[PDB]
Design a binder for this molecule. Structure first.
Ligand SMILES: *[C@@H]1O[C@H](CO)[C@@H](O[C@@H]2O[C@H](CO)[C@@H](O)[C@H](O)[C@H]2NC(C)=O)[C@H](O)[C@H]1NC(C)=O
Ligand SMILES: *[C@@H]1O[C@H](CO)[C@@H](O)[C@H](O)[C@H]1NC(C)=O
Lengths: 97, 236, 292
């Protein structure tokens, strides 16, 4: 994954699809960009996957539920390639616990 | 003739070969045993001589062409209204000493009567000793093909024959090409099937290219000159 | 679909290789909508299968799959037509907008396809040595094939030059001798391009200092016609499916509507997947959030 502002040498490319395949759930949510943290809750029960998210230090709120019928097994965090995250120019760090 | 099939013996019993200097140069058509129809431009000076010519009839192949032929060649008759720079009235008459004996595969064509109501796009046949290559070399057997009559008002278009067609001139062949005459077919008989009777309505005069697009054939309109032919019948 | 047919005034609606009743209560994975105006003169050419100009040069409807057709109308008071030529080689050599009139649609009558080497230009040196019927010649960009013109000898004329694509590509005597060939469009693509009259392209005696520009009259194979009927314009649309009984996109008509609530009356509720019975009474609350 690359950054939109102050783009890196390469380009963001994680999927190759000429057309949009069959998707099950698509929505867009908003959040405050002035916050300093973000909290996420993900889990599954009886084949139903739930999602929760929150901006500040408060209990998370409902996002959505999805019926898949299959038990997922793996998750991953794509590294961010940017020309500004390096500590040489901005002294910033990425944190994802 | 390019793109034509071989003519079987006893199919077109009117192919008369005119050979000068012991080699065939021009063809002809037989209507009466005393007169042969040929081209006038090929009989011009200095070739306009009663001698130094030979007529061959019934020769189904060039291999049989050798010493021994028909009767002697008499004087030639040309249309006084013919010209060299402008192609017009290209009809010549050849006379023979002895009459042509009608053999098995010998049958003269009938002259077209004034008034026939010919079809505009009518299929006709052209037979002779032509070529199938670039100007060709020779011809050892009879070659015959079929063509169509292009309209006069259509053949003289501004892109092909703009102001180059006389009232006594017709076009035979295909506009797309690949089927036409070539060099050496002087006097090619143009016969058509009408009421189970063959009629001679064309005569090879000139042309451009051989079996090419946008270049149809050129033939003379004999029906206009038929009366003049009868004039020769009043002469001899 | 019922709301769509109700809001938009539908004049005719049919379906090929599928039933209209089966649409009510099904799910399609994807839908492709192809819409365009309807010419008044050639409306009957919109039948399922015909050798018309519209189906052979503008848009053909494939009958090997389940699809639907919808002819509807639209108030001609605010209808504007944006005409364009989806041809690359035609636009390359100097094509421009039609600008004929308003409330008029243009349909192509003949389609011609070419390769990436054609040029409506003759050779300057070849056209210079033509004292009879000299074709116009000019320069082409880097990489093309000039007009095939050959000088043939005649009885007295020695500068008679012929070319290809004569007289016109619509009524050419020898189609095999011309570069551009008539082609029929299939399903999915647009028209290749209009006809090009090589006799009206370029200038005479050009010393390789002018491109090959054809006049507006040099393009043939199209006709414009009005589309106004009873102060309205007729528009055709084609719905192509991609799957039956498979897909997230379903029909909302076969669902439960949102009825009106009733107070002080014992009512059976099915609220948010939770069923029950009870009475409703209006009250003022402030503790409800967006997600709650
Ligand atoms: C959610 O928001 C994103 C960002 O605004 C949308 O992504 C844009 O979509 C439009 C239309 O397809 C494109 O022209 C943009 O290039 C997209 N931008 C980015 C950054 O991807 C996305 O479409 C929205 N999702 C929904 C369901 O509306
Ligand atoms: C009982 O009847 C009264 C008068 O008809 C009516 O106003 C009220 O809503 C009724 N209550 C119920 C629960 O049906």
């Amino acid at each position: 994954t690359i950054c939109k502002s102050k783009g890196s040498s390469r380009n963001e490319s994680w999927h190759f699809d000429k057309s949009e395949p069959l998707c099950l759930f698509k929505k867009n949510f908003t959040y405050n960009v002035s916050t300093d943290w973000l909290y996420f809750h993900f889990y599954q029960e009886r084949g139903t996957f739930y999602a929760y998210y929150a901006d500040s230090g408060m209990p998370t709120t409902f996002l959505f539920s999805l019926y898949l019928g299959t038990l997922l097994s793996h998750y991953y965090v794509l590294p961010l390639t940017c020309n500004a995250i390096s500590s040489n120019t901005d002294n910033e760090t990425l944190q994802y616990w | 003739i390019v793109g034509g099939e071989s003519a079987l013996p006893g199919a077109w019993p009117w192919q008369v070969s005119l050979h000068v200097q012991n080699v065939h140069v021009c063809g002809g058509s037989i209507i009466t045993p005393e007169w042969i129809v040929t081209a006038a431009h090929c009989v011009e000076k200095p070739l306009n001589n009663p001698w130094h010519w030979t007529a061959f009839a019934g020769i189904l192949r060039q291999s049989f062409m050798f010493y021994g032929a028909g009767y002697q060649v008499e004087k030639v008759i040309s249309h006084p209204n013919y010209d060299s720079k402008t192609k017009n009235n290209d009809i010549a008459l050849m006379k023979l000493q002895k009459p042509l004996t009608f053999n098995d595969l010998v049958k003269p064509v009938c002259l077209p009567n004034p008034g026939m109501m010919l079809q505009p796009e009518q299929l006709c046949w052209i037979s002779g000793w032509g070529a199938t290559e670039e100007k060709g070399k020779t011809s050892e057997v009879l070659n015959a093909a079929k063509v169509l009559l292009i309209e006069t008002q259509r053949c003289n278009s501004r892109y092909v024959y703009d102001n180059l067609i006389t009232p006594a001139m017709i076009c035979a062949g295909f506009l797309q090409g690949n089927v036409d005459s070539c060099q050496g077919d002087s006097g090619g008989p143009l016969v058509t099937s009408k009421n189970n009777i063959w009629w001679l309505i064309g005569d090879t005069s000139w042309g451009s290219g051989c079996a090419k697009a946008y270049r149809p054939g050129v033939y003379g309109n004999v029906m206009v000159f038929t009366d003049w032919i009868y004039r020769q019948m009043r002469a001899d | 679909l019922s709301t769509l047919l109700r809001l938009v005034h539908t004049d005719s609606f049919s379906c090929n290789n599928f039933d209209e009743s089966k649409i009510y209560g099904s799910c399609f994975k994807s839908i492709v909508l192809d819409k365009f105006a309807i010419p008044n003169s050639r409306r009957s050419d919109l039948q399922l299968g015909s050798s018309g100009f519209l189906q052979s040069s503008n848009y053909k409807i494939d009958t090997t799959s389940s699809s639907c057709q919808l002819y509807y109308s639209l108030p001609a008071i605010n209808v504007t037509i944006n005409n364009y030529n989806p041809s690359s080689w035609n636009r390359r050599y100097g094509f421009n907008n039609f600008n004929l009139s308003s409330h008029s649609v243009v349909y192509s009558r003949y389609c011609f396809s070419v390769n990436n080497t054609f040029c409506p230009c003759a050779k300057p040196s070849f056209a210079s040595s033509c004292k009879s019927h000299k074709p116009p010649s000019a320069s082409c960009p880097i990489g093309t094939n000039y007009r095939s013109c050959e000088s043939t000898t005649v009885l007295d004329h020695t500068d008679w030059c012929r070319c290809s694509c004569l007289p016109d590509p619509i009524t050419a005597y020898d189609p095999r001798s011309c570069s551009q060939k008539k082609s029929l469009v299939g399903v999915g693509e647009h028209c290749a391009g209009f006809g090009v009259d090589e006799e009206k392209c370029g200038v005479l005696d050009g010393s390789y200092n002018v491109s090959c520009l054809c006049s507006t009259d040099a393009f043939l194979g199209w006709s414009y016609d009005t589309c106004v009927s009873n102060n309205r314009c007729n528009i055709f649309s084609n719905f192509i499916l991609n799957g039956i009984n498979s897909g997230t996109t379903c029909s909302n008509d076969l669902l439960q509507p949102n009825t009106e609530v009733f107070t002080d009356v014992c009512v059976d509720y099915d609220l948010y997947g939770i069923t029950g019975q009870g009475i409703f009474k209006e009250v003022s609350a402030v503790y409800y959030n967006s997600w709650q």
